[PDB]
Every structure is written in C-alpha cells, then in structure tokens.
Design a protein around this ligand. Structure first.
Ligand SMILES: CC(C)Cc1ccc(S(=O)(=O)Nc2cc3c(cc2N2CCCC2)n(C)c(=O)c(=O)n3C)cc1
Length: 111
C-alpha cells in the first residue's frame, strides 16, 4: 500500500494543485459544456483523474506521472485559442508546475 514513492507522488500532486490557484485543472473539462472537446483531445487529463490513477497504482515511475501532468497542459494549449485565460493559465502551470516536478524528480531519483 504505502510506499515512499507513492507518498512522494501524493506530495507532488498536492504541490501542483497548489499552483492551479483557480482550480481550473482540478476536475475533468466538463464534456457537457464543450461537446466538441473529444474531437480534438484524445486523452483528457486533470488533477482529480491523476489522483485516481495514483491511488490505483497506475504510476510506477516518475516519468508516467509527469506524462499525465504534461497532458493537462498540452491538452489545454491545444484546445484553446492563445488569447484566453485557459491558454494563459496552462502556460503558467507549465512554468510553475515544471519547477515543482524538477525538485520532486530529484527525490524520486534517490529511491
Ligand atoms: C472565461 C473562462 C475562464 C470562464 C469559463 C468558461 C467556461 C467554463 S466551463 O464550464 O466550460 N468549464 C471549464 C472548461 C474548460 C476548462 C476548465 C473548465 N472549468 C471547470 C471548472 C473550472 C473551470 N479547461 C481547463 C480547459 O482547458 C478548457 O478547454 N475548458 C473548455 C468555465 C469558466
């Protein structure tokens, strides 16, 4: 159950959600509100879905965790026009969440 790596991934996920101060990536993009979303985005991602994958043991190395974080950003940049709050927020999350992942990957390395 509890492993140091899974505890580290929990801490890191918390740290990334902290940077999404608007909570706009906290849950899946509401498919009812944007029914064309799945025509552009093959694999939606969000922080709640990441928590679901984490607790279901779907991340066994830091790479796979980071790959899902990257989808939260790249999905948002891909779907939204550049001059939008969403697009700008994904850029901000890319920068701020990148710093989070850098220091968390160091801890995953020495494990
Ligand atoms: C001017 C606006 C910022 C005002 C605004 C517009 C639409 C909507 S919403 O009801 O459509 N909800 C929504 C659509 C998203 C989205 C995230 C959300 N939420 C879920 C709850 C947090 C915001 N994200 C992350 C995307 O990347 C994306 O492309 N979309 C379509 C919500 C707010």
């Amino acid at each position: 159950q509890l492993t140091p790596f899974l505890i580290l991934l929990r801490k890191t996920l918390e740290q990334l959600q902290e940077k999404d101060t608007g909570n706009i990536f906290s849950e899946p993009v509401p498919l009812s509100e944007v029914p064309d979303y799945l025509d552009h985005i093959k694999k939606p991602m969000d922080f709640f879905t990441m928590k679901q994958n984490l607790e279901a043991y779907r991340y066994l190395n830091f790479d796979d965790f980071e790959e899902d974080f990257n989808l939260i950003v790249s999905n948002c940049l891909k779907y939204n026009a550049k001059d939008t709050i969403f697009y700008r927020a994904a850029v901000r999350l890319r920068e701020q969440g990148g710093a989070v992942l850098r220091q968390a990957r160091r801890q995953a390395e020495k494990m």
